[PDB]
Enzyme design. Structure first.
Site, PDB file in Angstrom:
ATOM      1  N   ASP A 218       0.845  -1.166   0.000  1.00 12.86           N
ATOM      2  CA  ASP A 218       0.000   0.000   0.000  1.00 12.86           C
ATOM      3  C   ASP A 218       0.875   1.207   0.000  1.00 12.86           C
ATOM      4  O   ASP A 218       1.251   1.670   1.068  1.00 12.86           O
ATOM      5  CB  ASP A 218      -0.843  -0.124   1.253  1.00 12.86           C
ATOM      6  CG  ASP A 218      -1.980   0.827   1.498  1.00 12.86           C
ATOM      7  OD1 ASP A 218      -1.960   1.916   0.952  1.00 12.86           O
ATOM      8  OD2 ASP A 218      -2.889   0.486   2.257  1.00 12.86           O
ATOM      9  N   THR A 219       1.135   1.839  -1.150  1.00  9.36           N
ATOM     10  CA  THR A 219       1.984   3.026  -1.185  1.00  9.36           C
ATOM     11  C   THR A 219       1.326   4.173  -0.481  1.00  9.36           C
ATOM     12  O   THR A 219       1.965   5.192  -0.278  1.00  9.36           O
ATOM     13  CB  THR A 219       2.309   3.408  -2.641  1.00  9.36           C
ATOM     14  OG1 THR A 219       1.098   3.389  -3.372  1.00  9.36           O
ATOM     15  CG2 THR A 219       3.271   2.431  -3.309  1.00  9.36           C
ATOM     16  N   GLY A 220       0.096   4.044  -0.028  1.00 14.79           N
ATOM     17  CA  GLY A 220      -0.559   5.139   0.596  1.00 14.79           C
ATOM     18  C   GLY A 220      -0.533   4.926   2.086  1.00 14.79           C
ATOM     19  O   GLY A 220      -1.081   5.783   2.772  1.00 14.79           O
TER      20      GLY A 220
END
Lengths: 99, 99
Positions: free
Chosen positions: B25-27
């Site tokens: 999850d790059t967020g």
């Protein structure tokens, strides 16, 4: 581009002439953008958040241009604390996670 | 690998001998994993969620092995609905977003 994640991967998006910056979030299935007026025909949609569900407006077929790449997809517009580019549009621009 | 986002980017992680699957999850700035017993010394930490803040336990220095790549970082362990590999560990394995 090649983007590393040492810092939150924010990018500039152009939507509506309006130019905003948003998070490329491989963990977000949907795009949720801050309140703006998109010419369109919308349908209601409830999305979850810290503290509860908020109502947002769903615009299908919007053209958006992420790091210079035109993409057509649905965006949800609503009182979100952060502009998120989720997987529904990361797909169109050809994003991959690579290691 | 090269991972596309046409489907949620789940991967198998090995932590504690225990083998789980988690979302890249790059967020997510942090890693939050489902309740498991990690040998360690932990410090409390509150994290936000739909409906409210939940308390989780913070383990620093844990070795984890994401898609066969050893990585040392902090993991938060707690009643999370989903196992998230966030940017604090995507960094170590050398993840980039590419398009």
């Amino acid at each position: 581009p090649q983007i590393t994640l040492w810092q939150r991967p924010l990018v500039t998006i152009k939507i509506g002439g309006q130019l905003k910056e948003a998070l490329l979030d491989t963990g977000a299935d949907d795009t949720v953008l801050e309140e703006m007026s998109l010419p369109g025909r919308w349908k209601p949609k409830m999305i979850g958040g810290i503290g509860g569900f908020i109502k947002v407006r769903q615009y299908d077929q919007i053209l958006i241009e992420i790091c210079g790449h035109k993409a057509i997809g649905t965006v949800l517009v609503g009182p979100t604390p952060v502009n998120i580019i989720g997987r529904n549009l990361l797909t169109q621009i050809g994003c991959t996670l690579n290691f």
